[PDB]
Structures are given as structure tokens and as C-alpha cells.
Design a protein around this ligand. Structure first.
Ligand SMILES: CCCCCCCCCCCCCCCCCC(=O)OC[C@H](COP(=O)([O-])OCC[N+](C)(C)C)OC(=O)CCCCCCCCCCCCCCCCC
Ligand SMILES: N[C@@H](Cc1cc(I)c(Oc2ccc(O)c(I)c2)c(I)c1)C(=O)O
Ligand SMILES: N[C@@H](Cc1cc(I)c(Oc2ccc(O)c(I)c2)c(I)c1)C(=O)O
Lengths: 386, 386
């Protein structure tokens, strides 16, 4: 492992992936608004496709792993980038409703998953000892890029039209393909289903319990951002532009990603899991103490803490997987962990909204968002004892 | 050399290049017409950029060769395809006059040259004994694809608009990039200018005289198609749709490409050059006997012969270069031959038009188009004597 050098170049490519994928998805809602402007001059489906894209990313990793194991990081990443580019291109072309849904959701999500998992796998390939620092740098850069995307996307959208926006996103995907072409391998590479789906990583019950804890904790991850924005917009009004929450969340999340990437490098072994546990607990608390402040003063601090803990957890995830299962079978571990997190991630916000509708208040929604992090914290705390 | 097998796959990729490049250029005029439709609702520059693109292709081969020698066929071809894709993309975006000229001409032509020369070089890499057959197949397929392009291009253009057309051409270029990624190498790979521009191939005076003859002959290549169409449209009117000439030219050119690719495989050595000489002479005659028939009956036959000879010469070119200079330095020979042909090719049609304007009749234009082929025939006839 070079521990740097050309690895840094790979890191750049890795960044250009998270950033792009996740930024083109954080902007999905904006696109729909533009579609509404084009819906006239001649139903509630935006959320369905918006969640379908990310859900497809997560659901298709259990398989992207099969490939990256067999084919390799470069081939899988390039194929995913190509599929994403074609999805965006065909979305630009077609002017319809069902075909747009199929194209965007299926093609873009599948390509995004294929281009996303090999990035983490190759990052592990190169450093293997400073993996914490590399993951922190990648997370911080990707966060900055993803935040930056909506501004330009909305300005272009207000400028001309939707198809041009899809063209711009497609060229972004093309540049991602070109960069992903740099994942130079550095490590050795009826019964067909039994060899493609060996599920050998699911032995070593420490990984099993770790994955269970992460999956349980992910059930309350996507609530306290979208629901927090909708709740501050609806309740806690009479405030000026309410942008402080978003900006502080982003800044502290980036700083926490960098800091956690750096510090995780120091802890010897499975003690790294403790870094998650702590953060997990905080997350839960930082949710349960969101609606207890009558003024925005407490909201600023709670949002700062929320973003810091989010960055901690996000950047910490992958190095722990590589330490747990080793480098040879880290791709399978990452893929199956993402697949397991797939369902709670999409099931969280819907449950929060359903509870809000049933009770009419966001209190229960935020409490139920905060509890699963604590449950996962307990499970992960028990993990390293063996 | 496999003499086939995976080489055939490469052949397919090779086809997808000529076809695309040359088809997107044969359609350039159509695009300008569409621009004229968009010029209203709010000068004579079409020919300048249309010729600039092809001229840039030819002018930049003397260098593309340097690269393909040093970097390799795959890297150079992929870079050229990427530059072409970005050129088409930015042409789709910008709505102006000077920026469109710069983008299309410079970017598209440079990318086209970069993606074009390595195709021939790799075709030589793989077969090396059936190179005649491979070149014939490539030429026939590329001719069919290039003649097919204008129909779809014009139908889409009449459908919606120009930017969508540029998007479609850009995705064509992207597919060309993906295919060009298959050029797997099979052969070993103040003073900086003296090593990058060694010009070692320009020894072995047989190659020198061959290149001189080809350059002289190319001076009268592009006249008897564009000027022939304009002359049949202007003079020889009262005829139904005048499509017989074009269709017969294309069909016989494809058939001749295939047949010459096959037969050239049989001639042992430098005797292959004779195949050019013969065809060259015919070309000249087939020009000088264009305006001597008062009815279209002779025109059909003369066009058939013209297309047959054109296919002969086009498909024959490269195998002779590989036989002459060998496989190691065939890339430099091809690149410098293309660079030398660059100037007469662009200087021919302008001289034909100038003579037509000065005299007012196409007779002198066609005579001067036919003579240079005969001069080149004489030179190439003298070539193999040594
Ligand atoms: C302003 C202008 C800017 C210009 C832009 C910049 C241009 C310069 C950059 C050019 C790029 C750099 C050159 C690239 C070099 C590439 C060579 C290389 O590195 O190796 C190639 C790489 C690896 O080659 P390799 O050489 O390294 O292989 C290593 C093995 N040894 C060591 C033996 C050589 O090739 C690949 O493996 C990539 C395969 C990816 C396959 C993708 C195809 C998937 C298709 C999916 C289907 C999509 C269709 C969807 C269907 C939809 C249906 C509706
Ligand atoms: N807030 C994020 C959303 C987001 C959150 C989580 I947990 C995700 O799963 C990860 C993340 C990092 C890893 O190293 C691994 I292994 C899995 C993903 I993929 C996305 C965003 O939208 O950018
Ligand atoms: N009629 C063609 C025009 C065209 C004619 C000639 I001569 C060209 O130079 C070649 C051709 C084949 C070779 O093997 C070599 I080496 C050089 C090119 I490039 C294009 C078309 O427009 O398709």
C-alpha cells in the first residue's frame, strides 16, 4: 500500500463520485418543481421516484459487490458511470411521465450504486493504514460538492429549462466516468448462485452484530433533516430565511467528517467501533432534544451537534468494515451492509410522516427518529466485547 | 497476429469510428440549413467551418502519430473520442456564431483525427496478413453507416431542433469512445522536438515517392462528388429526383471497397501499388468523360465507375503503407501521409469552383479534377520499379 502518492489521485476521483451522485439526487426535488412549471401550458409522484433512486442504489449493492469482486473496481465503476450517463441523457430526451420515471430511477440509481461502491473499495485498496484520513477527506469533499450542487442547478433551471439541466448533469456523469477510469488495481483479484452469493462474510458473528446494529441505527437517519426543515418552515415561523440551520449543519458535518477521519486512524483495532457508539447515542439525544426549545438559540446548537455526529458516523463507517473483515472481503462487507441499510433508510421518513399525520405533532416523529440510534448504540457497544 | 478472432471485434469498433466521424461531417451542411431556420425569428460561413473540420482532421495527424507511437492506440483513441464528445456537447449548449465555429471545428476535428488514426493502426496491429480484408470490411461498413446518417439526421432536424441533434451526435461520439476502449495493444511500444519529430519514415525513398504520388492524386478527389451534384442540379435538369447517381455511387463504392480489400490480400508485395495505379488512371478518365454525355444514360455508368474506383483506392491505401514501412513504423507513415493529403484535399474543390466561376462552365473544372489522378498514377507506376 503506497499510503498516499497516487492514492491521493484516486481520492480525488472518489470525491468526484459521492459529490456528483448525491448532489444530483439532493437536487431531485428542484427538478420536479421545474417539471411542474412544464406540467402546465398544455399527482404525488415526486417523492416516489426521488426515494426510488436512492433505494435502488442501496438495494443493488449486495450485487455490485459480486461484480467488483470478480471483475474489479475499475470495470464496475466505469460501467456504472456509463449507465448513469445514459440514464441522464435519455431523461433529457424523453418528454413523458412513466418513461422519465423508469429512466431516472432505474438507470441512474443502478449506475450510481455501481460507480459508488468501488470508490470505497479502491480507497481501501490503496491506503489500508491511513484509510481513516482518506475516508475523512473524501467525505468532506463530497459534502462540500453536494451542497454546492443545488445552487448552480437552481440557477440554470431558472435560466432556461429542464432538458439543458439534464444535459449538464450528464456531462458531470461523463467526467465522473473519466475519473473513475483511474481505479488501478493494487490487490489480487444451479451451483452458480452458490458461488456468486457465497455470503462468506456473514460468518464471523462480530460482523453480523455490527451490521445488525448499523441497520437498526439507520432507521432514524433521514428524518431529522427533511422533517426538521419542514417543521421549522411550518412551526417556528417569523424567523428570517431559516438558512442558519442548513449552513451550520453542513459546515459542522464537513468538519466532523474530517476530524473523525483523522482521529479514527489512531485507535488500534475494534475499539474504533466505540467512536460509532458514542456518536450514535449523541444522535438519538440530539433528536429527542430538538423540539424542547422555544427559541432558535437552542436550535442552532442542536443542529450543530446533529451535523457533527452525522459526519462522525458517516466517515467512520467504512474503515471499521475494512478492519473487521480485512481487505480481501471488504467489498462484500460494504455491499451487504449497504443493502441491509437500504430498507430502514427508506422506511424511516415515511414512518415519521405517518406518525406526524396520525398525531398532528412532530414530537413523536422526532422521538421515534432518536430511539433507533440509541438501540444501535447499545448493540454496537456490545459488539467489541467479543 | 491472431489473423481474426478478437481482431474482428476491433474491426467493429474501427467501423463505428469512420462511420460516425465521416457521417457527422457529411451532414454538416444540413445542420447549417437548420441554423438558417434559427437565424431568423430575431454570411457565407458554412463552407469555411465544414472544410475546417476535415482539414483539421488531416492537419493534426502528423501529431496524433507522435502520440499513438508513444502513448498507444487505446489512449489516443479514447482521448480523441472524449474531445469530440465535449465539442458536440458544447456546440449543443452555446447559442452563438463564433463560439460555435471554434467548438465544432477545433474540438470535433481534433478529436476525430485522434480517434481515427489509431483505428487504422490497430487494424494493422491485429491482422497483419489479412489486413486487406479487414480494411475492406471496415471501409464498406463505414460507407454504409455514413450514407445512413443523413437520413436520420434530417428527420430529427425536421422533428424538433438543432440542440437535440447535437445531443444525439454527442451520444454517438460517446458510444464511439466506449468501443474505442477495446484497442488492446498487441505489439511492442531543444532535442525533444528532434525525438518527437524524428521523421525516420521519410527515408526509404520508395515511401517518399509513394507519398508524393498519393498527395498529388488527392488534389482531384473531392471535386467530382460535390461539384457533380451541383452540376447535375444546375445543368441536366428536367430529370426525376436525380437520386440514381448518389445511390449507385454509394452502392458501387461499398462493393468496390469490399472487393479491393479481398483481392489486395493476394498480391505478394509492392505489386499492390499497381492496384492503385490502375484505379488512379480510371479515376482521371472517369472525370474527363463526365461532361461528354448528353443523356443520363452515360452518367449512370460513369458514376458507377467513379464509385468503384473511389472504393478501390480508399480501401487499398493503408495495407500498402503497412507493407511498405512495416508494422512498427506504420503509424507514422499513415499519419504523415494523411497530413500531406490534407492540403490538396481542401485545395481541390476551391480551385474547381474558381475555374467554373472564371469560365462559367464545369468542363474545365472536371478536366482539372481528372488530370491530377493521372499524374499520381504515373508517379505511383514509377514507384515499384525500385
Ligand atoms: C475541454 C476539453 C477537455 C478534454 C477532456 C480530457 C481528454 C483527455 C482525457 C481522455 C481520457 C484519458 C485516456 C483514457 C485511457 C483509457 C485506457 C485505460 O486506462 O485502460 C482502460 C481500461 C483498463 O485497461 P488496462 O490497460 O489498464 O488493463 C490492465 C491490464 N493490463 C495491465 C494487462 C494492460 O479498460 C477497462 O477495463 C474499462 C472497461 C469499462 C467498460 C465500460 C462499458 C460498460 C457499458 C455498459 C452499457 C452502457 C449502455 C447502457 C444500455 C442502455 C440501454 C437503454
Ligand atoms: N447524508 C448522506 C446520506 C447517506 C448516509 C449513509 I449511513 C450512507 O451509507 C453509507 C455512507 C458512508 C459509508 O462509508 C457507507 I460503507 C455507507 C449513504 I451511501 C448516504 C448523503 O446524502 O450524502
Ligand atoms: N470519401 C471519404 C473521404 C476521404 C478520402 C480519403 I483518400 C481519406 O484519406 C484516407 C482514407 C483511407 C485511408 O486508409 C487513409 I491511410 C487515408 C479520408 I480520412 C477521407 C469519406 O468522406 O468517407
Amino acid at each position: 500500500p503506497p499510503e498516499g502518492g497516487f492514492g491521493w489521485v484516486v481520492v480525488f476521483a472518489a470525491t468526484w463520485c459521492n459529490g456528483s451522485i448525491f448532489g444530483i439526487h439532493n437536487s431531485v426535488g428542484i427538478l420536479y418543481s421545474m417539471l411542474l412549471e412544464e406540467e402546465k401550458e398544455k399527482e404525488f409522484q415526486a417523492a416516489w421516484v426521488g426515494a426510488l433512486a436512492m433505494g435502488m442504489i442501496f438495494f443493488c449493492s449486495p450485487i455490485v459487490s459480486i461484480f467488483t469482486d470478480r471483475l474489479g473496481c475499475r470495470i464496475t465503476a466505469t460501467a456504472g458511470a456509463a449507465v448513469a450517463f445514459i440514464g441522464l441523457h435519455t431523461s433529457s430526451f424523453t418528454s413523458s411521465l412513466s418513461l422519465r420515471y423508469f429512466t431516472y430511477g432505474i438507470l441512474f440509481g443502478c449506475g450510481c450504486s455501481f460507480a459508488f461502491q468501488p470508490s470505497l473499495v479502491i480507497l481501501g485498496h490503496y491506503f489500508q493504514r491511513r484509510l481513516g484520513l482518506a475516508n475523512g477527506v473524501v467525505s468532506a469533499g463530497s459534502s462540500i460538492f453536494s451542497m454546492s450542487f443545488p445552487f448552480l442547478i437552481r440557477m440554470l433551471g431558472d435560466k432556461i429549462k429542464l432538458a439543458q439541466t439534464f444535459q449538464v448533469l450528464s456531462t458531470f456523469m461523463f467526467v465522473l466516468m473519466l475519473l473513475s477510469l483511474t481505479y488501478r488495481p493494487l490487490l489480487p483479484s444451479l451451483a452458480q448462485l452458490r458461488k456468486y452469493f457465497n455470503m462468506r462474510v456473514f460468518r464471523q458473528r462480530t460482523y453480523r452484530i455490527w451490521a445488525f446494529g448499523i441497520a437498526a441505527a439507520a432507521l432514524g437517519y433521514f428524518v431529522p433533516y427533511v422533517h426538521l426543515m419542514k417543521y421549522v418552515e411550518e412551526e417556528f415561523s417569523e424567523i428570517k430565511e431559516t438558512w442558519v440551520l442548513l449552513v451550520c449543519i453542513g459546515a459542522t458535518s464537513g468538519l466532523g467528517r474530517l476530524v473523525s477521519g483523522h482521529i479514527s486512524d489512531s485507535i488500534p483495532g475494534l475499539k474504533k467501533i466505540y467512536l460509532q457508539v458514542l456518536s450514535f447515542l449523541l444522535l438519538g439525544l440530539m433528536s429527542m432534544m430538538i423540539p424542547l426549545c422555544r427559541d432558535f438559540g437552542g436550535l442552532i446548537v442542536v443542529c450543530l451537534f446533529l451535523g457533527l455526529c452525522d459526519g462522525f458516523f458517516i466517515t467512520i463507517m467504512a474503515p471499521i468494515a475494512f478492519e473487521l473483515v480485512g481487505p480481501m472481503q471488504a467489498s462484500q462487507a460494504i455491499g451487504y451492509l449497504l443493502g441491509m441499510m437500504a430498507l430502514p433508510m427508506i422506511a424511516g421518513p415515511p414512518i415519521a410522516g405517518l406518525l406526524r399525520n396520525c398525531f398532528g405533532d412532530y414530537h413523536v416523529a422526532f422521538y421515534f427518529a432518536g430511539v433507533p440510534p440509541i438501540i444501535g448504540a447499545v448493540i454496537l457497544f456490545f459488539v467489541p466485547l467479543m
